[PDB]
Every structure is written in structure tokens, then in C-alpha cells.
Paper text:
The [name] non-structural protein 2 ([name]) is a cysteine protease (nsP2pro) that processes the polyprotein and thus it is a drug target for inhibitor discovery. The [name] nsP2pro is a papain-like cysteine protease. The active enzyme consists of two subdomains; the N-terminal subdomain (which contains the active site residues C477 and H546) and the C-terminal SAM MTase subdomain that lacks enzymatic activity. The substrate binds in a cleft between the protease and the SAM MTase subdomains.
Here we report a high-resolution crystal structure of the [name] nsP2pro, which contains the wild-type N475 residue at the N terminus and [name]/[name] surface entropy reduction mutations in the SAM Mtase domain distant from the active site. Surface entropy reduction mutations were introduced at residues K741 and K767 of the SAM MTase domain where the lysine residues were mutated to alanine. The goal of this modification was to obtain crystals that would diffract to high resolution for use in ligand soaking experiments and co-crystallization trials. The construct harboring the [name]/[name] mutations yielded crystals that diffracted to 1.46 A resolution. Inspection of the electron density maps revealed the presence of two conformations of the N-terminal oligopeptide residues prior to the catalytic C477. Electron density for the N-terminal residues was visible starting with K473 of the A’ (active, ~45% occupancy) conformer and N472 of the B’ (self-inhibited, ~55% occupancy) conformer. In the A’ (open) conformation, the N-terminal loop is exposed on the enzyme surface and the active site is accessible to substrate and ligands. In contrast, the B’ (closed) conformation reveals that the N-terminal residues 472AKANVC477 are flipped into the active site and to the interdomain cleft beneath the β-hairpin, thus acting as a pseudo-substrate. The B’ conformer of the [name]/[name] mutant nsP2pro construct used in our study was considered to be catalytically incompetent because the density for 472AKANVC477 is continuous and of high quality.
Residue numbers in the entry: 472 to 768, 775 to 785
The structure:
């Protein structure tokens, strides 16, 4: 759906409107570029917008109708469509009152360092959080290295007979488990960057056992995970028996894409909860728990309590 190939090529003319010309070395700081995976050009544009200018796309910085970002035949491209992006000079003028060197940054493809108000060359560690965004929940400021969590016990306690585990292998005592992964021993072997295959069956429980590494900040970890929520967790709703359950590893919804994705998933289930079991030691990691698919019968406040 939102992940398609050639997203980096499609972004070249968009980024050029802000003076940005990415080298291979700079593209390699986008994880899916280095590993050659399908991605959303919009999520990547948002990531680069924060890295370069300290503002996310909701600032309007790229809202001019200059270059299309379109999805055609599983590719991102610049074919005509209403979904157009480009440096918006009127927005730059408005922001320059608060950020006086920002017009120079967007003319020359330099980083505007939000900590100093001065220009820098590209480094992904300079601007870690979009200063324009009202975060829906508190973020972890002090992350530590911990052993990986083991969610076998959690899934075993869920109600349901059939389980689809997506991502890394997970045994679930007492249930019948199918495993979707790009590993050779998977039940269904597929590239996970292309999402849950449409021909996968329906299940009582889907557990998205997929993690994203912490590199610079909770915000980075969340935005890097958003595409996985879009291609895996969001597609789980097509693969659930009536009243079924989806559980997914996540990191909250620090970024705009994750917030939209999680909200859309939650509206399809009777109950939505965030849980942090005892085996989950990494400070940013949570489980999103969606109970009662296609049935009727605080998320942000729970995340704030977990992450404060």
C-alpha cells in the first residue's frame, strides 16, 4: 500500500526544491535505503524534513504544489496527481520570524540546527524532534540497552485458537501457530516490507513480532517503525476472524504517521489498550492490544504514564 519501491528516486525532485542533493552516504542514513526495502516516500520526506529543518511536514514547509509523489504499479514516482510537494516560500517567510536563518537553510540544502539557530551540514543527530508538533504523549528521554523481550507468555494468555506470528519466530504453547517471515523456516515466506500477503488466511490472533532499533531518540525509533505498522499491523484487519485480536510491538505514536495509523486501527476494534509486560525491558517498547475486531464495546494518557 504505502510502501513501494523507488521512493528515494521519487524524492529527489522534491528535496531539490529545498536545495537538498543527497549523496549515497547520506541516503544510507535512511535504514531502508541501505537494506534496499520498499518504503513510503511521504514518511521518508517527513523524516528528512525533521532532520534538515527541525520541523515535520505539518509545518507546511513542503506544501507547495510543485512535484507529485504518486504511487503507480507498486512504485513511488512523480507522475501527475494531486499529491504534490515542494518548498513553500510563503511558509518559509512566516517561519523566518521565529527562525531567522531558516531561509538560508532551505535555499542551500543546509541543516537548520534548532538548538543554535545556525547552519550545519547534514548529520542525522542534529534535529531529533519536530519543534512544531504537539506530541500526543510523553517520550522516553533516557533509553538503555536491554536484552530482547520475549512475548511468548503474553500471547499464550490471549483468547483464541489460531495465531499468525508476523516477523521473528515466536512459539505459543497451547495454540496453533502459523509464521509469516522472510526466514527459510517460515510457514509463509515473504518479504515483510511488502506487507502481509493478501492470500494469507484469517486468524483468531495476529501477533506482530517486529522490532525497530533505537539509534538516536524515541522519536526516531517510532518514525522508523511507522512503515511496519502500516504494512503489517494495519493489514492484520484483513486477516482476522470476527471478534479477533491483533497485538503489535510498537513505540507509541511520537510521529504523525504512527498516530494516524494507530487511530485508524483502533476504530476497527471494540477495545484498544497499551500494555508493557514484565518481559518488556526496553523503555520505549510497548504492545498495542486490539481486542474485538468488527465489534463495539486514554491510549495517549497510558503511553504518557508508561514513558514519563
Amino acid at each position: 500500500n504505502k510502501a513501494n519501491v523507488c521512493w528515494a528516486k521519487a524524492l529527489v525532485p522534491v528535496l531539490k526544491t529545498a536545495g537538498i542533493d543527497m549523496t549515497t552516504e547520506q541516503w544510507n542514513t535512511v535504514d531502508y535505503f541501505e537494506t534496499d526495502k520498499a518504503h513510503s516516500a511521504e514518511i521518508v520526506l517527513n523524516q528528512l524534513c525533521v532532520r534538515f529543518f527541525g520541523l515535520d511536514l505539518d509545518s507546511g514547509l513542503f506544501s507547495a504544489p510543485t512535484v507529485p509523489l504518486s504511487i503507480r504499479n507498486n512504485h513511488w514516482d512523480n507522475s501527475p496527481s494531486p499529491n504534490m510537494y515542494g518548498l513553500n516560500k510563503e511558509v518559509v517567510r512566516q517561519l523566518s520570524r521565529r527562525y531567522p536563518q531558516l531561509p538560508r537553510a532551505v535555499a542551500t540544502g543546509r541543516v537548520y540546527d534548532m538548538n543554535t539557530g545556525t547552519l550545519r551540514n547534514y548529520d542525522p543527530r542534529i534535529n531529533l524532534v519536530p519543534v512544531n508538533r504537539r506530541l500526543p504523549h510523553a517520550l522516553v528521554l533516557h533509553h538503555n540497552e536491554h536484552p530482547q523481550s520475549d512475548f511468548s507468555s503474553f500471547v499464550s494468555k490471549l483468547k483464541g485458537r489460531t495465531v499468525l506470528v508476523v516477523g521473528e519466530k515466536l512459539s505459543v504453547p497451547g495454540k496453533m501457530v502459523d509464521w509469516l517471515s522472510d526466514r527459510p523456516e517460515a510457514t509463509f515466506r515473504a518479504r515483510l516490507d511488502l506487507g502481509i500477503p493478501g492470500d494469507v488466511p484469517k486468524y483468531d490472533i495476529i501477533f506482530v513480532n517486529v522490532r525497530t532499533p533505537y539509534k538516536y531518540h524515541h522519536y526516531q525509533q517510532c518514525e522508523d517503525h511507522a512503515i511496519k505498522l502500516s504494512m503489517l499491523t494495519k493489514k492484520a484487519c484483513l486477516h482476522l476472524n470476527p471478534g479477533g485480536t491483533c497485538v503489535s510491538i510498537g513505540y507509541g505514536y511520537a510521529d504523525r504517521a504512527s498516530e494516524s495509523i494507530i487511530g485508524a486501527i483502533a476504530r476497527q476494534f471494540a477495545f484498544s489498550r497499551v500494555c508493557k509486560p514484565k518481559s518488556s525491558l526496553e523503555e520505549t517498547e510497548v504492545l498495542f492490544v486490539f481486542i474485538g475486531y468488527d465489534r463495539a464495546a486514554k491510549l495517549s494518557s497510558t503511553l504518557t504514564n508508561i514513558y514519563t
